[PDB]
Amino acid sequence: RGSHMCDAFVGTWKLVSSENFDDYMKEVGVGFATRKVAGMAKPNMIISVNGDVITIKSESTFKNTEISFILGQEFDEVTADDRKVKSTITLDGGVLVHVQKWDGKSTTIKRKREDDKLVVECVMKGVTSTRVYERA
Numbered sequence: 527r528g529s530h531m532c533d534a535f536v537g538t539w540k541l542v543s544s545e546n547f548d549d550y551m552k553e554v555g556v557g558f559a560t561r562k563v564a565g566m567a568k569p570n571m572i573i574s575v576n577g578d579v580i581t582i583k584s585e586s587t588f589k590n591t592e593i594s595f596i597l598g599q600e601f602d603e604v605t606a607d608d609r610k611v612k613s614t615i616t617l618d619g620g621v622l623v624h625v626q627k628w629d630g631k632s633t634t635i636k637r638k639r640e641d642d643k644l645v646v647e648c649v650m651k652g653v654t655s656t657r658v659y660e661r662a
């Protein structure tokens with residue numbers, strides 16, 4: 527019912543910058559045509575919290591996705607690039623840490639507040655992409 531730290535993430539966010547995302551997606555194993563169309567997208571990401579359930583929606587010309595979850599409880603997720611993964615999202619020190627597991631592989635997406643931005647850092651082995659969103 528009352529305020530939680532998680533509320534710093536809540537709201538409507540628009541992508542403003544993307545660095546190294548094509549190389550990150552190659553590491554993930556996204557095919558060419560999907561990478562090109564995904565990398566063009568300027569999604570809006572809508573984060574909300576209801577009781578213990580956090581919802582992250584991405585809306586764009588590429589794909590609309592929506593996940594709902596409870597921190598530390600694994601779920602099934604079909605990602606925007608069409609992987610079928612098992613995901614767990616935790617809050618570590620203020621950072622939401624989202625680990626996706628599929629086919630023996632793993633990718634971690636961290637989201638954090640920096641100034642008025644929500645920074646999303648996507649990591650697959652040694653390759654990192656930084657995506658910066660701002661309030662809509």
Ligand SMILES: O=C(O)CCn1c(-c2ccccc2)cc2ccccc21
Pocket residue numbers: 551554556564565567569584586588589605606607646648657
């Ligand atoms: O949250 C994001 O900004 C990127 C989400 N995302 C996307 C994505 C694509 C288009 C629109 C939003 C997100 C592709 C993708 C591939 C691998 C891992 C994460 C991925």
